[PDB]
Amino acid sequence: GQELPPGTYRVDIYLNNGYMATRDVTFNTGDSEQGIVPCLTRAQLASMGLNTASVAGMNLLADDACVPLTTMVQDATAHLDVGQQRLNLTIPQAFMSNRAR
Structure with a gap:
């Protein structure tokens, strides 16, 4: 449910199990695993x-x-792994341009 109150976290964005960027990522309160999203x-x-x-x-x-x-796109998610500082991310191939580099 809610199991992480809001803020920003320094982590590595991992789209489709592929590192994209390293930064802080502010979150707002929401509906998913942690109860917050980036x-x-x-x-x-x-x-x-x-x-x-x-x-x-x-x-x-x-x-x-x-x-x-993750509310205008389906099947995507943005799981902040705090424990590994790995902002586990997915996007369905439908919402991909052709290359996720």
Whole structure:
């Protein structure tokens, strides 16, 4: 349920079990494992190759929005592993441009 109150955490984004970036990632309160989710933006998402054009309503919002990645996209997730500082991430191939580098 809620098992981690909000803030920012220094971790490694791991999309589809592939390291993307190392940074702090602010979270806001939410619904999933921890009860919180990261403040991933248009730029940050599209950097992993997240296809904003696959989701009519993503491709118009701010490059520093708290995008509802896991509420406007299905099957994706953003599990903050605090224990390993590994922001375990997924995106379905549908919402991928062609390359997640």
